[PDB]
RNA sequence: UUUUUUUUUUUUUUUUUUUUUUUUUUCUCCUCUUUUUUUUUUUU
């Protein structure tokens, strides 16, 4: 949502695609291998998202 | 003879801890010559 005065970040969930997630797996990598785009949500035609 | 409207200095604070100088090496190593050893004694 906005940037605080000491580098803190406030985040909001004011939409329909945002909120608590369900089942799946999580993979954590360095935050420099992700390419900037305009659609970070994907529905890959393989059987998963 | 030139009207009307365009917000602004991050929210939070009432957290526990039962130790003690230093600290850790260096090897074996030819001693030259008048001697037995003098000696009581007294004046401090």
Description:
With 49 residues, this protein is mostly loops. Helices cover 0% and strands 8% of the residues. The chain contains no helices and two strands. It has strands spanning 2-3, 9-10. The protein has a two-stranded antiparallel sheet. Strand 1 (2-3) and strand 2 form a beta hairpin. The protein binds one RNA strand of 44 nucleotides through strand 1. It is found in: Cytoplasm; Nucleus, Nucleolus; Nucleus. This is Exosome complex component RRP4. Belongs to the RRP4 family.
Features:
49 residues, RNA-binding, Exosome complex component RRP4, little secondary structure, 1 chains, two-stranded antiparallel sheet
The number of distinct β-strands equals: 2
Rg result: 14 Å
Q: SSE string, helix = H, strand = E?
A: EE
Tally of separate helices: 0
For the record, give the distance between the C-alpha atoms at the N and C termini, rounded to a whole number: 25 Å
Strand order of the biggest β-sheet = 1-2
> What share of the residues lie within helices?
under 10%
Main beta-sheet annotation = 2 strands, antiparallel
Q: From the helix content, strand content and strand pairing, which structural class follows?
A: little secondary structure
Bin the strand percentage. Answer: 5-15%
| General shape | extended
By oligomeric state, this entry counts as part of a larger assembly
PDB class: ribosome
Keywords: Ribosome, RNase, Helicase, RNA-binding, mRNA-degradation, cytoplasm
Entry title: 80S-bound human Ski2-exosome complex
Name: Exosome complex component RRP4
